[PDB]
Design an enzyme around this catalytic site. Structure first.
Site, PDB file in Angstrom:
ATOM      1  CE  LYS A 239      -6.301  -7.163 -16.613  1.00 32.98           C
ATOM      2  NZ  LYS A 239      -5.172  -6.213 -16.791  1.00 32.98           N
ATOM      3  CG  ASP A 240      -8.503  -8.941  -9.137  1.00 31.40           C
ATOM      4  OD1 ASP A 240      -7.451  -9.166  -9.784  1.00 31.40           O
ATOM      5  OD2 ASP A 240      -8.534  -8.148  -8.171  1.00 31.40           O
TER       6      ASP A 240
ATOM      7  CB  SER B 156       0.928  -2.624  -8.118  1.00 28.80           C
ATOM      8  OG  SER B 156       0.021  -3.245  -7.240  1.00 28.80           O
TER       9      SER B 156
ATOM     10  CD  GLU C 108       4.529 -33.921   0.673  1.00 30.60           C
ATOM     11  OE1 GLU C 108       5.462 -34.768   0.567  1.00 30.60           O
ATOM     12  OE2 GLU C 108       4.361 -33.245   1.719  1.00 30.60           O
TER      13      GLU C 108
ATOM     14  CG  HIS D 264      -1.988   1.075   1.165  1.00 29.03           C
ATOM     15  ND1 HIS D 264      -3.123   1.013   0.383  1.00 29.03           N
ATOM     16  CD2 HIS D 264      -2.070   2.240   1.855  1.00 29.03           C
ATOM     17  CE1 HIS D 264      -3.860   2.089   0.594  1.00 29.03           C
ATOM     18  NE2 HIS D 264      -3.243   2.850   1.481  1.00 29.03           N
TER      19      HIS D 264
END
Ligand SMILES: CCCCCCCCCCCCCCCCCC(=O)OC[C@H](COP(=O)([O-])OCC(O)COP(=O)([O-])OC[C@@H](COC(=O)CCCCCCCCCCCCCCCCC)OC(=O)CCCCCCCCCCCCCCCCC)OC(=O)CCCCCCCCCCCCCCCCC
Ligand SMILES: CCCCCCCCCCCCCCCC(=O)OC[C@H](COP(=O)(O)OCCN)OC(=O)CCCCCCCCCCCCCCC
Ligand SMILES: CCCCCCCCCCCCCCCC(=O)OC[C@H](COP(=O)(O)OCCN)OC(=O)CCCCCCCCCCCCCCC
Ligand code: HEM
Ligand code: HEM
Ligand code: HEM
Ligand SMILES: COc1c(O)c(C)c(C/C=C(\C)CC/C=C(\C)CC/C=C(/C)CC/C=C(\C)CC/C=C(\C)CCC=C(C)C)c(O)c1OC
Ligand SMILES: C/C=C(C)/C=C/C=C/C(OC)[C@@H](C)[C@H](OC)[C@@H](C)CCc1oc2c(O)c(OC)cc(OC)c2c(=O)c1C
Ligand SMILES: CCCCCCCCCCCO[C@@H]1O[C@H](CO)[C@@H](O[C@H]2O[C@H](CO)[C@@H](O)[C@H](O)[C@H]2O)[C@H](O)[C@H]1O
Lengths: 385, 74, 93, 55, 246
Positions: free
Chosen positions: A228-229, A206, A272, A202
């Protein structure tokens, strides 16, 4: 001012999800973060509902999971979502990390953001291991045995740490009961770390695919990126659904459908899939102590990138040599995984040792050398004197 | 009735490819019994078997019988 | 409130970018635009372009690794067959 | 499409209508799928096996 | 690793339940149970399967009740405290042939026949493997193979040496529905039955998947369209620069 801004609780929501200024050009690679939050939620919700029907006693653990599979209404859906979801959580995390690597997201002023991310990664790996042990199948018992033993490599007190972790002479009831208790706890610590991760995100916002400032053209999170997400959220659910309903055991190991046996280690034991590259790294060092040190270093070396990246520009978008070697790194990582799934045999042992070298050389040698060369190439290609 | 799988196997062991495969397995089997009758077989640590040649035969048969066996079953 | 540390991003009205002048932008309501169907004929041959420049950076390292993998695997298969048991004893221990 | 303007008239569909349609969809969709599914697997189902049994 | 040690790769048979839209063949499940009862049950337990789960799957409520009552289970002690038995009910789990592990090993040359409740999911190859193993016993082991006493050869089992001998032979079972009980037919049936034992939710799971995938696919395609619409103003936005005079 609008209520969403004046209210003490809503303003947090507004600043993080509604009015948050996003660089106009971020691509779908920036959708992984929300997908990770979604994964965290799916794991927590499905785990709590299953916990309601689970018994941690070593004599009942395996059968209690079979009980969830057979007698609990929609139980198989909960277990398959949880198991396949853990795998999807790792696939998305690798992509989220790879995105950071490629776009120079670990760079200043986002170093703190990157460091917190490394911690989350370690915690997530530990959380999945603890969960895997709760099933108490063959892979559970030996995984718990091998991994708790990693600490025996510590000089002097190592064996004491192990007996303390076990709560006895070997992986037994005390062990599985404490691993379930811890498996329930860590996800909440991860949640707190995610908040710290978002707090660091924040303050600087970004980054973007061009690697330059996003301050000249921002668009609100709300509407644009919310929808968009949504696009990737559905695509993610569709694929997860294909596995959960049509191929629920493809990403697991058949030996975990066999109750754990303290006297027999299957010849077919394989870690795994998301742990294979690290496993291969450890296996490549023919020494106990150095094997575990090198494996842990393979994770901690991610902390070095802000210092070894000598470039004057953020990201690989306009860098020919860096793009090439980035993909060498990615495919080298996949190879490490393929080696981990193989037998400790002739061609494989050497290939694993070379791939291990390439893994470390990338951060410590290739990036600093290549970024320096690219710096100079950018200069002499335009300065006429 | 006669077993459906045994039928399809026998049928394929008699094709050109099948005969060639049993031949190689046969040539191996012959070579093996000759080594057993010779002195010092017990202590040799280099005894040859014909699993490999056998696997090639069985693999061929599997490849041909597998996609057809169930149309003959109920 | 408590003093906040200086960052490289502000908020609407004080984002922290340089003073802009001379740039004029234009846009048209999505409502007034041709409903989603025009992304073809005009936007199809244009596409696939942003991977024609990138595929080499992906393909070459991929090729190198796939070949290296195939080679080592086929060699392992040979070593564990009858024909290679001689070489196996040699390269093994 | 004038088909939309007859029912909702230039306005978006409201939550109440969305919720109402969802309850309807759930029932209809389930029957349609179960029907197709059981028909596609005719002969293999227990319903079919029980018909060939008499005790 | 050598082919013998790895074991022969099991081929892919055309199981009727293979495929996203395919349910189990319940007649085969019914038959598979008989093969299990008449052959396998003598050495193999099926601990995780409760009688009640058979109802509506392969048998009727009446048939299962009769089958359960043929077995005795421990009941609650009488008024005086002495123990007492009781015929089986639907809530009970299919009983095993041995009372404990030690008794099971004694009856099998020291080997332990695993429980088959999950056998289909606890092995690479699934149905293909189980079937191939049961129908893959050669009359004689390949030349040179020194098979230990009490062992048997099977190419599909890792290491080739398995402690279970061939147990399926033509017509050793009389199918209630008249089907020719060949070895491959019986193997096909138990295996189908064992797949159901391990995955009882199979038919229902695939039905739910069909609805889930259709809804999610639509939601996916729909979101793409909605996103493009909400972004049209930004995507087609245009800029012009007119350098400011000093
Ligand atoms: C055994 C293992 C099995 C593998 C398991 C797979 C792993 C699953 C876990 C996670 C899966 C969900 C995550 C989805 C996102 C991941 C991919 C991603 O972010 O790529 C972004 C990346 C960025 O794209 P962009 O520059 O922002 O987009 C410009 C668009 O034209 C801008 O256009 P737009 O916004 O107007 O529309 C964009 C696009 C958006 O479509 C989306 O939903 C997201 C984009 C994903 C494309 C394909 C992803 C394949 C994932 C596998 O919508 C479309 O029309 C494209 C549809 C194309 C095919 C989608 C797949 C259909 C599958 C059928 C089921 O897209 C790619 O380049 C795709 C690369 C594919 C290789 C991925 C390698 C890792 C594997
Ligand atoms: C559970 C909610 C309890 C709310 C108390 C009810 C009450 O009594 O709320 C009273 C307040 C009055 O506050 P006021 O702003 O009107 O001031 C008074 C005049 N100046 O109304 C609210 O806060 C309404 C807010 C509702 C939203 C609650 C949850 C928001 C979701 C995201 C949470 C983000 C926080 C994350 C923290 C880690
Ligand atoms: C722990 C850290 C290690 C990471 C783990 C390894 C990661 C494995 C998979 C993650 C993929 C990351 C892709 C790069 C991210 C990015 O940002 O790609 C950015 C680039 C290009 O973008 P562009 O803007 O330059 O295009 C130009 C616009 N100006 O996309 C691509 O070329 C497309 C993706 C290429 C395909 C990569 C496939 C690798 C996956 C292996 C599959 C595994 C199967 C088993
Ligand atoms: C990010 C968080 C989590 C991750 C990555 C995770 C991962 C896993 C994994 C890998 C398994 C084994 C899956 C398998 O069966 O093969 C597991 C099992 C389990 N988890 Fe979690 N888990 C998470 C959170 C939780 C939480 C909060 C609970 C709450 C109690 C929980 C409860 C359980 C239970 C009950 C099991 C056993 C049932 C099962 O095997 O699925 N998990 N988890
Ligand atoms: C549960 C795990 C995580 C969650 C929920 C999470 C979430 C987020 C979110 C929401 C974003 C913004 C959107 C985006 O860029 O995708 C973000 C950004 C970022 N995260 Fe994470 N993250 C997680 C793990 C990690 C890890 C493991 C790393 C690295 C080791 C990391 C590194 C970063 C970086 C560097 C950014 C900034 C990217 C940029 O703007 O270029 N994160 N994360
Ligand atoms: C058609 C009925 C039967 C089925 C479906 C069946 C199936 C199986 C399967 C799948 C295994 C596991 C093999 C593995 O580890 O991959 C096994 C093992 C075994 N079975 Fe059976 N079985 C049958 C009948 C019998 C009978 C009647 C006996 C007792 C005479 C028997 C004795 C054993 C033993 C001793 C093993 C241990 C193998 C070893 O550890 O080497 N089985 N069986
Ligand atoms: C500037 O960059 C950003 C950005 O800032 C943000 C915010 C987003 C949007 C994404 C997010 C905000 C993701 C955030 C996710 C989280 C914080 C997840 C935290 C995790 C949790 C597990 C929450 C805790 C949950 C619970 C306690 C509920 C579980 C239990 C229940 C329901 C009880 C069950 C029991 C009974 C009896 C009913 C972006 O996408 C982005 O880049 C584009
Ligand atoms: C209370 C919590 C405790 C005590 C422990 C938590 C912390 C430990 C880890 O990281 C956090 C740890 C998971 C590690 O990380 C370096 C992973 C990469 C593990 C890699 C790993 O996996 C294996 C595995 O899964 C197996 O299964 C069948 C079997 C294994 O041998 C055959 C391994 C193995 O040889 C290794 C190195
Ligand atoms: C997370 C669980 C999922 C829960 C369900 C998901 C949310 C469904 C919401 C469904 C309908 O919500 C509905 O949205 C439309 C806009 O799209 C609103 O419409 C409003 O905006 C539209 C668009 O400008 C106007 O035409 C309309 O006159 C106005 O009332 C409507 O009043 C509201 O009722």
């Amino acid at each position: 001012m609008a209520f969403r801004k004046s209210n003490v609780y809503l303003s947090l929501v507004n600043s993080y999800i509604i009015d948050s200024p996003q660089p106009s050009s971020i691509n779908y690679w920036w959708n992984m973060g929300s997908l990770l939050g979604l994964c965290l939620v799916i794991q927590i919700v499905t785990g709590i509902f299953m916990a309601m029907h689970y018994s941690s006693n070593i004599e009942l653990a395996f059968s209690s999971v079979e009980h969830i599979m057979r007698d609990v209404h929609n139980g198989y859906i909960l277990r398959y979502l949880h198991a396949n979801g853990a795998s999807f959580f790792f696939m998305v995390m690798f992509m989220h990390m790879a995105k950071g690597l490629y776009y120079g997201s670990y760079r200043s002023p986002r170093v703190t953001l990157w460091n917190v991310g490394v911690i989350i990664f370690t915690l997530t790996i530990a959380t999945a291991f603890l969960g895997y042990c709760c099933v108490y199948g063959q892979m559970s018992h030996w995984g718990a045995t091998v991994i708790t033993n990693l600490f025996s490599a510590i000089p002097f007190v190592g064996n004491d740490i192990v007996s303390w972790l076990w709560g006895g002479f070997s992986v037994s009831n005390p062990t599985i009961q404490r691993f379930f208790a811890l498996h329930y706890l860590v996800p909440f610590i991860i949640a707190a770390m995610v908040i710290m991760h978002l707090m660091a995100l924040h303050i600087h916002g970004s980054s973007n695919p061009l690697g330059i400032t996003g301050n000249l053209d921002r668009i609100p999170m709300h509407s644009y990126f919310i929808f968009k997400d949504l696009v990737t959220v559905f695509l993610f659910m569709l694929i997860l659904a294909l596995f959960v309903f049509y191929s629920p055991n493809t990403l697991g190991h058949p030996d975990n459908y066999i109750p754990g046996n303290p006297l027999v280690t299957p010849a077919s034991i394989v870690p795994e899939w998301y742990l294979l590259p690290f496993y291969a790294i450890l296996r490549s060092i023919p020494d106990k102590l150095l094997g575990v040190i090198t494996m842990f270093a393979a994770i901690l070396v991610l902390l070095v990138l802000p210092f070894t990246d000598r470039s004057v520009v953020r990201g690989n978008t306009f860098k020919v040599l860096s793009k090439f070697f980035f993909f060498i790194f990615v495919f080298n990582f996949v190879l490490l995984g393929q080696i981990g799934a193989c037998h400790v045999e002739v061609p494989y042992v050497l290939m694993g040792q070379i791939a291990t070298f390439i893994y470390f050389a990338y951060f410590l040698i290739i990036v600093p050398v290549i970024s320096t060369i690219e710096n100079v190439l950018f200069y002499i290609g335009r300065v006429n004197k | 009735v006669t077993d459906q799988l045994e039928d399809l196997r026998e049928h394929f062991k008699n094709t050109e490819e099948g005969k060639a495969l049993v031949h190689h397995y046969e040539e191996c089997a012959e070579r093996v019994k000759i080594q057993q009758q010779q002195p010092g077989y017990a202590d040799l640590e280099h005894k040859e078997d014909c699993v490999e040649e056998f696997f090639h035969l069985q693999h061929y048969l599997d490849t041909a019988t597998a996609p057809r066996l169930f149309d003959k079953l109920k | 409130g408590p003093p906040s540390g200086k960052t490289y991003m502000g908020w609407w009205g004080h984002m922290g970018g340089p003073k802009q002048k001379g740039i004029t932008s234009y846009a048209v309501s999505p409502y007034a635009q041709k409903p989603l169907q025009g992304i073809f004929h005009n936007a199809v041959f244009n596409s696939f372009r942003r991977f024609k420049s990138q595929f080499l950076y992906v393909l070459i390292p991929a090729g190198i690794y796939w070949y290296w993998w195939k080679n080592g695997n086929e060699y392992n298969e040979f070593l564990y067959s009858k024909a290679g048991r001689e070489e196996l004893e040699r390269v093994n221990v | 499409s004038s088909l939309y303007k007859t029912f909702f008239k230039r306005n978006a569909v409201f939550v109440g209508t969305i919720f109402a349609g969802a309850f309807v969809f759930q029932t209809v969709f389930d029957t349609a799928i179960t029907s197709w599914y059981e028909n596609h697997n005719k002969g293999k189902l227990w319903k079919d096996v029980k018909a060939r049994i008499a005790a | 690793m050598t082919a013998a040690e790895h074991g022969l790769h099991a081929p892919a048979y055309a199981w009727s339940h293979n495929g996203p839209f395919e349910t189990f063949d319940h007649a085969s499940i019914r038959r598979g149970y008989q093969v299990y009862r008449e052959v396998c049950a003598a050495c193999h337990s099926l601990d995780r399967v409760a009688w009640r789960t058979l109802v509506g799957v392969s048998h009727t409520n009446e048939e299962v009740r009769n089958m359960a009552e043929e077995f005795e289970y421990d009941d609650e002690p009488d008024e005086q405290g002495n123990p007492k038995k009781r015929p089986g009910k639907l809530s009970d789990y299919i009983p095993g042939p041995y009372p404990n592990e030690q008794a099971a090993r004694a009856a099998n040359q020291g080997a332990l026949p695993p429980d088959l409740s999950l056998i289909v999911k606890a092995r690479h190859g699934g149905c293909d493997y189980i079937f191939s193993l049961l129908t893959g016993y050669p009359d004689e082991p390949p030349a040179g193979v020194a098979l230990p006493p009490g062992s048997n050869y099977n190419p599909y089992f890792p290491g080739g040496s398995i402690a279970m001998a061939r147990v399926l032979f033509d017509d050793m079972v009389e199918y209630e529905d008249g089907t020719p009980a060949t070895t491959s037919q019986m193997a096909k049936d138990v295996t189908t039955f064992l797949n159901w034992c391990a995955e009882p939710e199979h038919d229902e799971r695939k039905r739910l998947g069909l609805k889930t995938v259709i809804i999610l696919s639509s939601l996916y395609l729909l979101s793409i369209w909605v996103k493009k619409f909400k972004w049209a103003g930004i995507k087609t936005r245009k800029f012009v620069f007119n350098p400011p005079k000093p």
